[PDB]
Each structure stands twice: as C-alpha cells, then as structure tokens.
C-alpha cells in the first residue's frame, strides 16, 4: 500500500518502487546484484543495482559511496547514466539497502568480441571507449577496472562504461581488487599505479577483440606475469630496478624473453580487409596496440596520445574529446578512512540528497 514493494529474485529480495516491475536479474557489479526492470513511469528499460548493507565494511562503504558520487557528478555520453537512487527504510536508524537505477544498454563486450568487426566499427567502439576514459581522467579519476564485462554497447553502435567501486585518483594507496587478465604490470607486481594504467586494459580489450580471446590469460595471479612477458617479452633492466627488491628477485629469475612482434602477436588473418584511404590500416591498429601494450608503465601512450593516434582521430570530435571534467565536491576524496558508523551516515547522507 505504501511507496514500495518486494519481489523474490532467487535468494535475494528487491524492495523497490512500484513504478519499477518485471525484474529479471542481469549480473553482479563490484558488490551488488543488478537487475533489469520496467519503468512504469518512464516506460523504458532500466538497470537496478542493489547493494546490501554497504556500510557493513570499510571495503563496501568506501567503494560504494564512490559509485554514488561518481555516478552523480559524472557527465558524458560514454558512461552509463544514473536515473535514480533510493532506499526503502525510514531513517539512519532503520537504514541499510541502496538501489541505483541506470540505463539499460542492449549488451556488452563479451560477445562483441565474438563477431568479426569491420575496422570502422572496431575503431569506433575503441574511439568511444577512450573518450569516456578521457572523461574521468580529465577529473583525476581512474577506472582501475575496465573489461568486456564492463563495457556496454547499443544496437546503433553507441558504447558505455560501468561500475565505479574501483575508480579513484593515483596511488598506491588494495591487492587483488582488479580483474586478473587486464592487470597491468605496475599492478601485477604491485609497484603503484598512474592513470595510463587504464590504457593497458584498452590494449587487452582491443587485443581480445581482434584476438578472439583473452590476450594475456593466466591461471593464477603469478602465472599472469609470465603470459604477459611470454607474448610481450622480458622488460628492460631499466624497468626492473624500479620493482621492489623482494619482488624483482623473482622477476629477474623468470627466464628471459624476446616476446613476439605485434605483427606475429596479431596477424592479419584476424583483421578484416581494409578501409578506403588508410588511417584504418591493420598496421595502424597494430601500431596502436603497440603503444598501449607496453610492459613499462612509464614508457606508455596517453589517451590524448591515443586519440591523436591515426586509427582513432578519424572520428575526432572535440565536443566529445574535450568537454568539461565533472565536478566532484572536494569534501570527498577517494582515500580517507572513517568509522564503523561514520560511513552509514555519509551514504544515507549522500543518498538523501540524490533522492
């Protein structure tokens, strides 16, 4: 009778606004199950991520509030669009479960990677990827965790980014947070990261796309390393002496490698026939991959370098490339710790604005 209602989705409950029905589930985010739904009002498909008592943990609470804010202040046609927050409870006293209502993209990379793409399509998808990426970068924010399962595309060939539990400014300042395969060496071998970490992923993601399968697979966090330098090759001494001794000892001990050339890494037999006039050459995407799939974090390409790059610039629209960073009210910063309870407030606090 009141504002809400529940539905039994498996061993989960969604209590949500009557206005949203017909919930299938769709996946888990960083820390919430997410559900597809009908918006009665808007008469349009949505996503609903529920996060169960996020305040239970310095993990949860932190990397949840993040999303909250981030989601809100975020403003770019390549990030998934927030459409609503809420909680059913009466007050801080009662409070626990949050819900986040978002746009429902048709699909996600996993099975784009599946079909064989025309250069243009491939390129475009990348293009956009980066432009979105550019966005948070332009605000000091780093996704930290981009993957197929995180990129969503629409049947017109629009493409967006998801889930912001992970996103923050540089470090280190958190071990096995990020997804195994798309871990960049500066992470694999925890040295601490900077924003062109995201570029690496894009590389694998793109690679994967072209490749047909995961680029650097790897059965366990440690076996990853090998896979990287199998294909890419044992990094320089100059790189090495930056690792922590404890770690390097091992790395150096790992047998030496040339690795392949990107061409053999990614032969044409995989690419489609080519464009009208160049820019969209196989060699050129290789040349991209080449500047992103670089073991050295410091000897790597930027995004504005990635958008300058020939294979990408063909669609270059500065009103997509260089719009304003979002504004984070700086009372929040992605680092500082709080209390067992302090958090419960912040959220309810931050939720109460939004709803």
């Amino acid at each position: 009778d009141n504002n809400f209602y529940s539905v039994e989705i498996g061993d989960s409950t969604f209590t949500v606004l009557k206005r949203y029905q017909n919930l299938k589930p769709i996946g888990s985010g960083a820390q919430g199950i997410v559900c597809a739904a009908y918006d009665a009002i808007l008469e349009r498909n949505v996503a609903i991520k529920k996060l169960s008592r996020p305040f239970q943990n310095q993990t949860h609470a932190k990397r949840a509030y993040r999303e909250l804010v981030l989601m809100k202040c975020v403003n770019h046609k390549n990030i998934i669009g927030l459409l609503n927050v809420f909680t059913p409870q009466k007050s801080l006293e009662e409070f626990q479960d949050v819900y986040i209502v978002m746009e429902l993209m048709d699909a996600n990379l996993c099975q784009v990677i599946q079909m064989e793409l025309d250069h243009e399509r491939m390129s475009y998808l990348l293009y956009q990827m980066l432009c979105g990426i550019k966005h948070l970068h332009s605000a000091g924010i780093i996704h930290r965790d981009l993957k197929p399962s995180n990129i969503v595309v629409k049947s017109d060939c629009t493409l967006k980014i998801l889930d912001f539990g992970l996103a923050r400014t540089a470090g280190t300042s958190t071990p096995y947070v990020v997804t195994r395969y798309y871990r960049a060496p500066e992470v694999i071998l925890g040295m601490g990261y900077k924003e062109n970490v995201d570029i690496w992923s894009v590389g694998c993601i793109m690679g994967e796309m072209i490749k047909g399968g995961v680029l650097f697979p790897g059965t366990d966090h440690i076996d990853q390393w090998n896979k990287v330098i199998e294909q890419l090759g044992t990094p320089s001494p100059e790189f090495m002496k930056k690792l922590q001794p404890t770690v390097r000892t091992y790395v150096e001990n790992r047998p030496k490698y040339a690795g392949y050339s990107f061409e053999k890494l990614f032969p044409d037999v995989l690419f489609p026939a080519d464009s009208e006039h160049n820019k969209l050459k196989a060699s050129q995407a290789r040349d991209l991959l080449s500047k992103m799939l670089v073991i050295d974090a410091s000897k790597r390409i930027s995004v504005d370098e990635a958008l300058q790059h020939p294979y990408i610039n063909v669609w270059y629209d500065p009103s997509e490339a260089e719009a304003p960073p979002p504004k984070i009210p700086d009372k929040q910063l992605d680092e500082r710790e709080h209390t067992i309870e302090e958090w419960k407030e912040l959220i309810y606090k931050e939720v109460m604005d939004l709803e």
Binding site: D106, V112, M115, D118, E120, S155, C157, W315
Partner: peptide, 10 residues
Amino acid sequence: PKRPTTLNLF
C-alpha cells in the same frame, strides 16, 4: 568516413 549507426548482436 561515416560513423556507423548499427551494431549486430544477432
């Protein structure tokens, strides 16, 4: 060089 407006997820 025109941006594409379809994507197939068959």
